[PDB]
Amino acid sequence: IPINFTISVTTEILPVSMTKTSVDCTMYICGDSTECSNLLLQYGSFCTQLNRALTGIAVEQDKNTQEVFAQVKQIYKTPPIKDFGGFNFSQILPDPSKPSKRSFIEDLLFNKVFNGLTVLPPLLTDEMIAQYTSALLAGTITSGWTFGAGAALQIPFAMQMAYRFNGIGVTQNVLYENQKLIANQFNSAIGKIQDSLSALGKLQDVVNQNAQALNTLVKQLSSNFGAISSVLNDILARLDPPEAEVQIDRLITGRLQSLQTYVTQQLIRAAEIRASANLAATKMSECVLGQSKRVDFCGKGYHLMSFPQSAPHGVVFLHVTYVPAQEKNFTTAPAICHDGKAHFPREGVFVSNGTHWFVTQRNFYEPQIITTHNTFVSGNCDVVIGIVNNTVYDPLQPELD
């Protein structure tokens, strides 16, 4: 049975969206020549198909971001008074000093990261995302999980902590008799987080991949593809249409192949990012807005709550967990029979230190005395494999006098 416990804050990084780019099709393939455009016009709707795919991807990126972050309708705000029972959320809460309403960690995150090729601005800037994260933090702090099902219900933070321990099989009094200890542990952990961050391979890999693909697409414009020159301006000159047409056709075929390859790779990468964004949205909905009971879904150990923070093209979670620390070997017994009636533990487990017998909860050593309210009777101690002899207090006969 564990005797002590520790609180550990764990971080997790998830990509959400990628840069939205749109490729000017006829400007890439032919540039600005009229003859090249007329000669390309006789292939079909490849140009339009590519443009439509590249616009669908861009729309889907904003859909992903909106699904991940827009989970609340009312923008809650924390009161100026900061009395959370000793906890210190100053590191993760917005500070008025900074121009943008970004926290001390949301800013440390931001400091760690002719052809026809254009980029498009995101629908949501980096200020609205920060406002969403601040609203989520304020709601979680000041209303618990109640704001994820209806109107916010205010409640003292210490009582919320007590109920969150109650949710994982640890009685309330463990918090109430140790509040300063958990407060200090949580403050030290959240300090160590910012110490360690000052790491983002997942967020950087997508940027590197997109840059590499865009650069390869750019560099594919300097290949002959079997022609005499790699520039259309040297084909339009020094040659008349009748024999310049074949070389222009070769260039057109090469550049169409390059465009199709790039579009296919972009589509596959967009599908992968969509899957990651769906996973991040599920984590935000379940770990943050409520307490989770899925093992190793919101951090290692028993889950308490999570706090969301934004990041460039991604989201960061700070899972607060609960881990037992020190163990003590004990001798146990399945049941105890007093007078031919086998008593089973109501919610605890029977332990003994060598001379006496006690009943305690599983996740934190708190030895109590066996009574008729911690046990329920069933049958006789003749069929249970493991049984011992002991007496139940039965606090009724002393008061009869």
Binding site: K73, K77, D83, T118, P122, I155, P156
Partner: protein, 116 residues
């Protein structure tokens, strides 16, 4: 003079021996904003990503200036998106362009000995 893109960006004049820089003419893209042909016929055109000195009501936006629509100081829910936190709608009649609003704002009455 050449760049990463392997395209010329600097050239020396063969007569005055002076170097010149060359940059592309802005092209961008054209988008049309409409509230549906069933309701009305007025439309607004968005010249994407171009300082509209180049293009021959104007409202400069980060995604490119939008013409044919007015700018208001209010903020409502996003009807149809533009970019960089700006949305347009047919609420007021003409086409208006505003900044999208996240939602209603409320402050939870929180104190250390109050429950609801």
């Amino acid at each position: 003079g050449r760049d990463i893109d392997d395209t010329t960006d600097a050239v020396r004049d063969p007569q005055t021996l002076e170097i010149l820089d060359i940059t592309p003419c802005s092209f961008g893209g054209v988008s049309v904003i409409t509230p549906g042909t069933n309701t009305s016929n007025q439309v607004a055109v968005l010249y994407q990503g171009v300082n509209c000195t180049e293009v021959p009501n104007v409202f400069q936006t980060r995604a490119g200036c939008l013409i044919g629509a007015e700018h208001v100081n209010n903020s409502y829910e996003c009807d149809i998106p533009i970019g960089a936190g700006i949305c347009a709608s047919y609420q007021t009649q003409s086409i208006i362009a505003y900044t999208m609003s996240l939602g209603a704002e409320n402050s939870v009455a929180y104190s250390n000995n109050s429950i609801a």
